[PDB]
Amino acid sequence: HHHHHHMVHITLDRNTANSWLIISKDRRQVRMGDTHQNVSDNKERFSNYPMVLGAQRFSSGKMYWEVDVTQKEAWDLGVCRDSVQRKGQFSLSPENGFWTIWLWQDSYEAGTSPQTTLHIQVPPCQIGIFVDYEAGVVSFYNITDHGSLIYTFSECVFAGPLRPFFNVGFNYSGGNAAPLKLCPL
Numbered sequence: 001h002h003h004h005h006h007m008v009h010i011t012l013d014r015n016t017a018n019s020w021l022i023i024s025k026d027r028r029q030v031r032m033g034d035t036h037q038n039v040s041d042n043k044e045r046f047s048n049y050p051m052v053l054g055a056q057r058f059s060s061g062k063m064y065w066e067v068d069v070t071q072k073e074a075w076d077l078g079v080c081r082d083s084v085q086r087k088g089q090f091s092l093s094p095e096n097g098f099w100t101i102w103l104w105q106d107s108y109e110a111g112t113s114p115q116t117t118l119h120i121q122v123p124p125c126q127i128g129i130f131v132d133y134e135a136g137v138v139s140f141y142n143i144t145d146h147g148s149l150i151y152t153f154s155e156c157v158f159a160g161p162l163r164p165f166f167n168v169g170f171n172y173s174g175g176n177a178a179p180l181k182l183c184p185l
């Protein structure tokens with residue numbers, strides 16, 4: 001792909017984070033803590049899952065960023081509406097305001113309803129995410145495999161401002177403690 005020149009500098013929004021997440025000083029890395037991180041509750045925090053939003057809001061244009069997923073067993077990545085539900089149980093779908101892919105139990109899937117199997121020969125260590133607001137497109141790229149396409153959501157109905165979306169996943173196994181990292185431009 002040739003989307004690199006739309007690179008944006010994403011930072012994580014502490015106020016949206018699940019209360020168990022640990023965000024680095026530079027707001028560029030996040031991992032699951034082994035306990036509650038001693039923050040007050042608020043209506044923005046994702047309560048049920050280890051999720052956090054980017055601080056940036058996008059309502060036009062073309063945007064690109066990259067995330068490091070090295071050694072993780074489980075994670076979700078993409079974008080979502082600013083007004084997605086924060087509390088209780090929900091599925092990641094475009095109907096609920098999410099355009100995402102994930103790793104779970106050694107398979108990669110796109111967050112359609114129902115979910116779509118992805119075909120990845122080279123397990124990615126870094127994922128590129130491209131959003132074209134006007135075109136209604138969200139695309140995912142395998143940076144480890146020379147930028148090869150993973151998945152394109154087209155005919156997207158954003159219906160609001162978009163925010164970068166992250167889920168570091170649970171760590172029931174003891175094998176999923178590694179962070180998500182926003183990679184430098």
Ligand SMILES: Cc1cc(C(=O)Nc2cnn(C)c2)no1
Pocket residue numbers: 041042043047087088
């Ligand atoms: C302060 C403050 C308020 C809340 C709050 O309302 N949380 C909530 C709402 N619905 N559910 C299921 C949880 N959390 O912190």
